[PDB]
Amino acid sequence: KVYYLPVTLTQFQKDLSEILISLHAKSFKASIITHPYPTLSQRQLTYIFDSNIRAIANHPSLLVDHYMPRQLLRMEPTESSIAGSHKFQVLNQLINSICFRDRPNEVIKCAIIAHSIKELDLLEGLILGKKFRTKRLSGTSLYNEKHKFPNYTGYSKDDYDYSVKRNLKKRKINTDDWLFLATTKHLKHDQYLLANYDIDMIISFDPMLEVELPALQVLRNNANKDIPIIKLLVQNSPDHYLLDSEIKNSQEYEEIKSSLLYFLQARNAPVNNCEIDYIKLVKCCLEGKDCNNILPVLDLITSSDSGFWQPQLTKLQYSSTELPLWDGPLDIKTYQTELMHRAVIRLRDIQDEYAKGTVPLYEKRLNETQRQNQLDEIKNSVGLTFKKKQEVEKSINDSEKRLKHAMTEST
Amino acid sequence: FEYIDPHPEDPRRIYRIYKILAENGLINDPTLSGVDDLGDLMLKIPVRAATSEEILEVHTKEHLEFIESTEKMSREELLKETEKGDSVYFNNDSYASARLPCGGAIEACKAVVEGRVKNSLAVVRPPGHHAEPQAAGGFCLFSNVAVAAKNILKNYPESVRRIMILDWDIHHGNGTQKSFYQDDQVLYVSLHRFEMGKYYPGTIQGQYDQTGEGKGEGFNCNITWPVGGVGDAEYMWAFEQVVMPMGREFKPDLVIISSGFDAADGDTIGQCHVTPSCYGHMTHMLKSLARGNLCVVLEGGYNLDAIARSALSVAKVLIGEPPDELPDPLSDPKPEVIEMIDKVIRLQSKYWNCFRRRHANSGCNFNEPINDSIISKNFPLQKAIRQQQQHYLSDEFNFVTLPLVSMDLPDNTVLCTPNISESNTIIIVVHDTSDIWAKRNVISGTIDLSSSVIIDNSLDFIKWGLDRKYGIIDVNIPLTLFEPDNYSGMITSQEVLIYLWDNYIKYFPSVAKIAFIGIGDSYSGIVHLLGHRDTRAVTKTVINFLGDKQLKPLVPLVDETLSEWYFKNSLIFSNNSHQCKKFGRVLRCDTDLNNIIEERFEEATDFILDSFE
Amino acid sequence: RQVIVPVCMPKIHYSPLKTGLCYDVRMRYHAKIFTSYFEYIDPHPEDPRRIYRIYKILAENGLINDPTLSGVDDLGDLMLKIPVRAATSEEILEVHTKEHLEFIESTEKMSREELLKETEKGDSVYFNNDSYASARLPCGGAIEACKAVVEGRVKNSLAVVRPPGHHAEPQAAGGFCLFSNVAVAAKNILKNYPESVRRIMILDWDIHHGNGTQKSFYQDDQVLYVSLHRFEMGKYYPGTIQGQYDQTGEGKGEGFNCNITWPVGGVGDAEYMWAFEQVVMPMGREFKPDLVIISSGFDAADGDTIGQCHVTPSCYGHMTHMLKSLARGNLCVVLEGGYNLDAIARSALSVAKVLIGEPPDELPDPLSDPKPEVIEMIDKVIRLQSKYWNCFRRRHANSGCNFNEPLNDSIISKNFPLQKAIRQQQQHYLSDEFNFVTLPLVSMDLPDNTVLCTPNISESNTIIIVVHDTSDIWAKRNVISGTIDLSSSVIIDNSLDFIKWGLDRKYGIIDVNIPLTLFEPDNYSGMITSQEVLIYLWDNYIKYFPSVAKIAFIGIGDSYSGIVHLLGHRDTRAVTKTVINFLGDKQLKPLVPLVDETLSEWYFKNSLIFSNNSHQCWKKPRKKFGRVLRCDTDGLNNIIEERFEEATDFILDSFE
Amino acid sequence: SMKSLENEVNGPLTKFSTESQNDFQSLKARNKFLKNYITL
Ligand SMILES: [Zn+2]
Ligand SMILES: [Zn+2]
């Protein structure tokens, strides 16, 4: 059972992919139509292109080619970490829904597969404090807890030792659902890595699992029911081309070029898939039905023309800066230096963008407060004049009474 | 034009608070609009409204569709839904301003918990402490603090797992209790008047004996002031004896004060005398409770100057000044507060551990019911005394019991001699159960049987009354029985005495020369039979052994010579160390309970024999 | 644009200021003169190596800006250095006699052997040639500290200052004290400022009784003295009558003096928490002081081999937090005691953290349920305090003086029986659903329902015996005033769970009750009665039963002597197998063997006794009592409902 | 959006140092922080 989930990018992800398009556009259009300064081939240029665009596809802080110091990484709140990409938002929402379900004693299992290592480290950093009996099947774990999986002499000369049967009545036990963490490198190196554990679903991070792997095949063969496999799936991705060529029922360079053309032609593809419930979906895949809650559209519509080849950013309120397209050759020092200070001037744009949008709300609050003060001052004066009317009524009626008596004596 | 009497939930209270805080050198914002540069002592936290995802966590779909539909209604539809609900009001301008409270609380709590700030004060209206999860109520639209707590508990399951929430608003926090009556990771405590229907809202979930349900049992505490009019020392004693020890017991990760200043001094709705210094001291202790994790939100408050001074003092202690001194320490609170506090400590000791072995409770285990069945090991003691005394008077003089049809009472509650209708001369004794003279083991709460000095003082009159061949009518009243807790010995004494005079004394063929003997504070029931009826044709005199109890005023209802005859025909012995016309001839005794009984048994029985002649 | 409120200064007084600090390198020269090598393996009852450790550890956590540990001015942003001055003679003379000053003026210029004679001569003190000015420096420095407090230059003051000054008398010196420290400073502020300070409360948590300052204000009202110490009337230092809990001031100083005395060494934190939240906060609020002063001594901390208590520094934090809450904010802390350096370092760290303003951390354990001697101690305190103070009245319901001369015993012939009642009700509901036979017993003067017997006991194979007194009575004191309500009391059955567990497995079940005799400290004649009836029932009935095997006995409370005497004066080990007893708190039962001597070993083998955690022992029993076990709770009910499973598992282990 | 890009560049940054503790933004209100991990 293989199901799919609609993922979009975010505003930050789209801006960073526009930055990479601005850094790769001349070389990509050329391929379509310290060190010696000759650096790399065009094949290496598009390898840099699709690898860094898949790095944008998963948590856009991954564009740094510098290891995490493994100190601050376990020292960050969940909200700012999932603020980078929508993938972390839907993944965190998914595991929070699968944790807070209704349970009799249900000790169901879970497993999460990543494609590479640093993604699994970010997974472990996100899932660290969360209430789950975890076990990392990859090296260099992060604060490893020892959840291990299933498969009184008062005097001399005497022996009563009730403490052995006593301590099973005071030792409280965990009842979390079980979860494991591994990469596809381990599954492709060796097998039977997951066949030991009777897992129940593969909510995998990677979308290109090649489902009939040998350990995965014996996993499908041993269990009683079919194991649901759920991948994350970005809407218009370079991987989405190969996944749509797979979605029915050298040469890799051609596939790379056609996938990148499907990506950049559908760069500003404005349609989106939304309204996904999670609880009914996990009820479907754990309780074993055809999950119709997923959106089955799975594919978008697309010779070589011009116009989606100059990079164009998002809309900015009175900032108005350009993208210089990098028309020329490349050195890795110049690559990272141009990327660095281009991100610097981009952050200067967003800095002035936020820094200017202050004072109209300020004047709005000023006028709103003066409006409200005028409002309740009017309400106070209304209460005052209503009290004065309610106090002059009595003298009106008494004056009417003495006019009556004046009329009697008049007659 | 009800502008002279506005409803006291209006937007300007927050403006009064913000005015005072700027007026005492805290805020450097002159214009009284929300800016970011506040100064050096505080930091303005921004605020965004609550999304649907966080607000559906505790509230249902139907309530959200209801509040979403009521945004753009008509005039008359909003008026009809305003009169439909229990003390609420809707508006065209109501929906987006009901999504900002939960957001403000959530942002204050997240800035505290993430360690961007020490403690947080969030002046926010509308209130959010009465609303049930499925329906609004009582000028509450969304239950703010429950939203915030559950949002922390999901969004931070790595540094927060236990949260203690206090409510010092004089109204009971109905919906926030109902949202957590099955949870175990959240503690709720409230202080309010209860009174069963007189004060808002007055339902069964405001009563103290509700403790929780299921696995969330023992995480809910209620302190019910039975009468309004409390002052400082009531709050101080309630904090010292209840709040702080259970707080130090629970080890909270986060403390949520849901403040409502409606019980302050100078109000009209609550009518108390709470000075702001008492608030300062209670916040000082609550600051001391956990490591400092305090969010402070607002619920009540219906008088501007009082809530101004109160929030001033709370801001002063939350920023770092010590709380100021009290107006009067020699305060000595009301005793019914003390006995209900003891009643709380009983069931808290049933659930917690910090009240056993320090309030004389480790003797019995209250987790089983006080039963007469063999399922529970505990057995009440009145059954044994009346059983043994019934067996004794059954073997000696074969005394019948008088059955009480249509009254839910035990069987041998009152006793008579057989052929009591043909007994021409009846003496009706109403006695109380005796007081014992032993030592109480102050830790365990138990007494020692070896030093148990117990005397049945009431029996001896029967030993006089059997010598005169008089008819005997014995009455015992149980002092509240400790089991039902709604019991009152007074009104039930009135029940049985009125029931006896109307049901059986008016049908005896040989009824003549009735005397009356009341012992202890039971005699007030005789007062209820003597101020409300006319028995003086058949009865002759009345005797009371009051002792050190307070005096009984007999006020007649049908005549006025009832009080004069009662002044003439009564012997009421009292305490020598009591020192204090319509009371009916109270007599100060000489030596001293049983000592005045053996001292004046002779004089009472000689007066009865002379009045009977 | 229109202004409505102007800008101005924050109209506060607390915390723009700092914490005043008194420290100097001049208080580390007065030292002992070497006598014997025992001082090398002795705790050195006052060393000068204390105050520099506190100053160093205060520098160690960024609270002090001094990288070189010397008396400097640039203390930092959180603390302010107070300059230190030695006192004049007049201020010491305000509390001390002139001849004491002449004695120290003699001691400043003595010889070596005269100094040795003076060190041996006095009461637990010592001297040196550099003792005069080093005694002149503390209190005047302390006089500086409160001078920064009342005049409001700082928030609060900490004066880490040695030698201590809470044992010296105005007449003579004692206990390594030369002058007073806190009494002289209090006198100096009272004399110097009778305008801003009108009442001073002083607290002592040194584990030794602060006798000297107690004497210095024993007849005054402007000083409220409260100390905490162990008493142990003769043994522990100083062990005088002035440290007793009934010393309540004198004259117009009546109702201004309070001792708290620990009966036994070994208290922890929650004793201190209980003592403060019960007692010192209402009395401190009732006194309405203008300044509180602390004579601190960390000798009662954990890890100290003098006082041997277990006060973690978090407890000190909660202490000083509540004491900061007591006054309006003015506060000064000096130091008296201390033997182990790491404990006083951690303690000083926590008290400095709170005195800057940080909240105290949590307790290392809140579940301790302190020792009952402290509870009875605080009751005996609150009696006399309810005589003098007022806020304790009617909350603990002492109701005035109420010192009760009755509980007279003269009408004891006329009394309710109360035991036949309990046993009769018990027999009633036991026979009502179990139909137990009231087996008779001739030739003894006992009540009828003394032994109750399972119907068809002759065919029953496995018979268990339960022996019990009349079960316990829990009552309720009425909280408003005084007495006990008897009607709101409860019988606590104790055997019935064992009886039901025996009945649902189809065992023979026999019960015996032994009433207690009146006005007896021990139920010795009751023990005689139990021995009589046990020997009787073993002879008359159990020897004659055809189908009988695997007998067990269930001992409860007292009257285990019946089973012990049955084991001793006969032999029945062929048919019975295992005894059990929950003693509780009575005296133990030695077994006398008469028929054999391997019977003693057999009694040690299959037997378990369960006692209190606070029994008279454990302060290792002899084998003639037979495998007692110290449970961890109190009361018979708690240990029954605690180890009921273990005992019933042992009984099931005894059989097949 | 600006907070996300700011916290991106303040984290692990790219190759140079051109533009590039209390207050502990990094979740350090230590109360059952390390202790909520099982530490065994
Ligand atoms: Zn309210
Ligand atoms: Zn000491």
Side-chain angles (χ1 to χ4, degrees), chain C residues 164 166-167 206-208 297 299 336-339:
Chain C
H166 81 112
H167 281 284
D206 188 287
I207 208 172
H208 323 92
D299 42 5
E336 294 302 277
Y339 292 85

Side-chain angles (χ1 to χ4, degrees), chain A residues 11-12 60-61 63-64 66 68 72 74-77 80 83 128-129 143-147 332-334 336-337 340 344 346-348 350 354, chain D residues 1-21 24-28 33-40:
Chain A
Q11 187 167 2
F12 196 28
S61 279
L63 297 184
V64 54
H66 170 260
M68 303 298 197
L72 196 45
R74 54 180 188 264
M75 221 192 291
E76 281 306 310
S80 306
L128 174 68
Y143 208 94
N144 172 49
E145 310 178 341
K146 305 301 173 286
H147 302 258
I332 41 164
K333 284 191 64 77
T334 71
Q336 299 198 17
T337 311
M340 183 275 298
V344 169
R346 171 65 213 154
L347 191 133
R348 285 298 190 187
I350 202 68
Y354 174 64
Chain D
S1 174
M2 64 86 47
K3 192 249 182 179
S4 46
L5 171 48
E6 154 65 56
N7 203 12
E8 208 284 327
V9 79
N10 210 357
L13 73 156
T14 49
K15 190 259 296 177
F16 205 72
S17 56
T18 301
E19 185 63 86
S20 52
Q21 47 90 30
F24 269 120
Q25 179 68 278
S26 163
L27 200 67
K28 285 290 296 312
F33 177 77
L34 72 160
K35 308 178 187 177
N36 223 7
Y37 308 113
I38 307 307
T39 176
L40 193 70

Side-chain angles (χ1 to χ4, degrees), chain C residues 251-263:
Chain C
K252 79 170 201 177
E254 282 283 342
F256 294 94
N257 185 279
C258 166
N259 304 353
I260 300 174
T261 44
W262 314 103

Side-chain angles (χ1 to χ4, degrees), chain C residues 273-290:
Chain C
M273 286 296 297
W274 176 255
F276 289 159
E277 282 185 3
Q278 278 322 114
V279 172
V280 314
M281 307 292 285
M283 196 187 301
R285 288 194 294 271
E286 195 175 14
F287 182 52
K288 316 154 299 305
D290 287 15

Side-chain angles (χ1 to χ4, degrees), chain B residues 23 248 357 374 377 379 433, chain C residues 11 369-370 487 500 637:
Chain B
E23 264 178 18
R248 259 188 319 266
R357 265 174 48 90
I374 52 184
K377 35 192 281 188
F379 302 106
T433 60
Chain C
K11 313 143 187 174
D369 304 334
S487 316
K500 285 193 278 189
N637 183 29

Side-chain angles (χ1 to χ4, degrees), chain B residues 127 129-130 138 167-172 199-200 259-263 269 299-302:
Chain B
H129 80 114
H130 279 293
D167 175 89
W168 68 65
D169 186 280
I170 207 168
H171 307 84
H172 165 266
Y199 214 83
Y200 180 82
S259 177
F261 301 98
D262 51 353
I269 299 171
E299 298 297 318
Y302 311 106

